[PDB]
């Protein structure tokens, strides 16, 4: 809800919100990944948010 508490979770596919954080993988050099978010995308580089 608009006034509900903040819940911990992880993003999924097709704007899906997952409540469990278990998609762990070994860190790879030169990381880069686009992820669907709302009507656009979220860009990440070296496992760090970009814009």
């Amino acid at each position: 809800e608009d006034q509900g508490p903040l819940v911990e979770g992880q993003l999924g596919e097709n704007n899906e919100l997952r409540l469990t954080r278990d998609a762990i993988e070994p860190c790879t050099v030169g990381h880069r990944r686009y992820f669907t978010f709302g009507g656009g995308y979220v860009y990440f580089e070296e496992y760090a948010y970009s814009h």
Binding site: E13, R32, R33, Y34, F35, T36, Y41, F44
Partner: peptide, 9 residues
């Protein structure tokens, strides 16, 4: 062409 999953793209 060759491709690799870059996440959702």
């Amino acid at each position: 062409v060759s491709a690799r999953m870059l996440g959702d793209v």
